Amino acid sequence: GIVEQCCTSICSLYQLENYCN
Amino acid sequence: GIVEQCCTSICSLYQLENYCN
Amino acid sequence: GIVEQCCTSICSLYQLENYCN
Amino acid sequence: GIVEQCCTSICSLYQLENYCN
Amino acid sequence: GIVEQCCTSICSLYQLENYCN
Amino acid sequence: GIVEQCCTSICSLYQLENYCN
Amino acid sequence: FVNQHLCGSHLVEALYLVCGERGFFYTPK
Amino acid sequence: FVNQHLCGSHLVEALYLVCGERGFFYTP
Amino acid sequence: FVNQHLCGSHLVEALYLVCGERGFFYTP
Amino acid sequence: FVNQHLCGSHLVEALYLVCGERGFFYTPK
Amino acid sequence: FVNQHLCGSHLVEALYLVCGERGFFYTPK
């Protein structure tokens, strides 16, 4: 999940898009 | 939807809570 | 105080209201 | 008050500091 | 500049990236 | 650099100005 | 609670606060 | 280890920018 | 343990939403 | 310092920065 | 990516996200 993936490492715009509808 | 109700118009707290899961 | 109460645990809207005027 | 001075109008830094404790 | 392109007008993602190093 | 100076201690407005253009 | 237009990032931050543990859906039309 | 509540605040704003009109679901 | 300066930044925005026209006092 | 209308959450964040250790009061009319 | 006017602090936050490791310059006219 986004918190596991993106809180201790930086999710780029590209990675963050996975979490979009 | 949420833009029409809370951005275009003004939402109450109760109205904002309609978009909680 | 709010920092002691609300930085290491999450204060809800309800708890945060204590700190209002 | 602060809305009239800094939101409705524009505040200088000095003017904003009038609302510090 | 960036205000004219992305604030006054609307920027694409590509246009916003013109201001990256 | 700003991150070294201003992440574990608080940089005032006065210190932050060093990082302006 | 504030009585104002909430838009864009401000609307999603409001949702984040108000919904707490429940979470929320931001699905603009 | 980072404060989850602060991280979440940041992530929902970033998701707002990235997702745009697609929107997104978020739960802590 | 969380950075107090970052926490405070967040808390004053949350207080803004929660308190509305009541307003609030804040000191670090 | 920025020369602009500061409103809502932006105004309170300005106050937070500018006032530092002194703190501030946000008491809209 | 959002399709909207980005101004002020929102513009600099967009830049921060979009530019990532590259960084950015915010030099208004």
Next chain:
Amino acid sequence: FVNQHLCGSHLVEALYLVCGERGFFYTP
């Protein structure tokens, strides 16, 4: 020790206020 990504997010907003029309450069 504070999350650099969150700190940076905060610092660029603060720099925006402090610097105004002077502008600023930022790199993580």
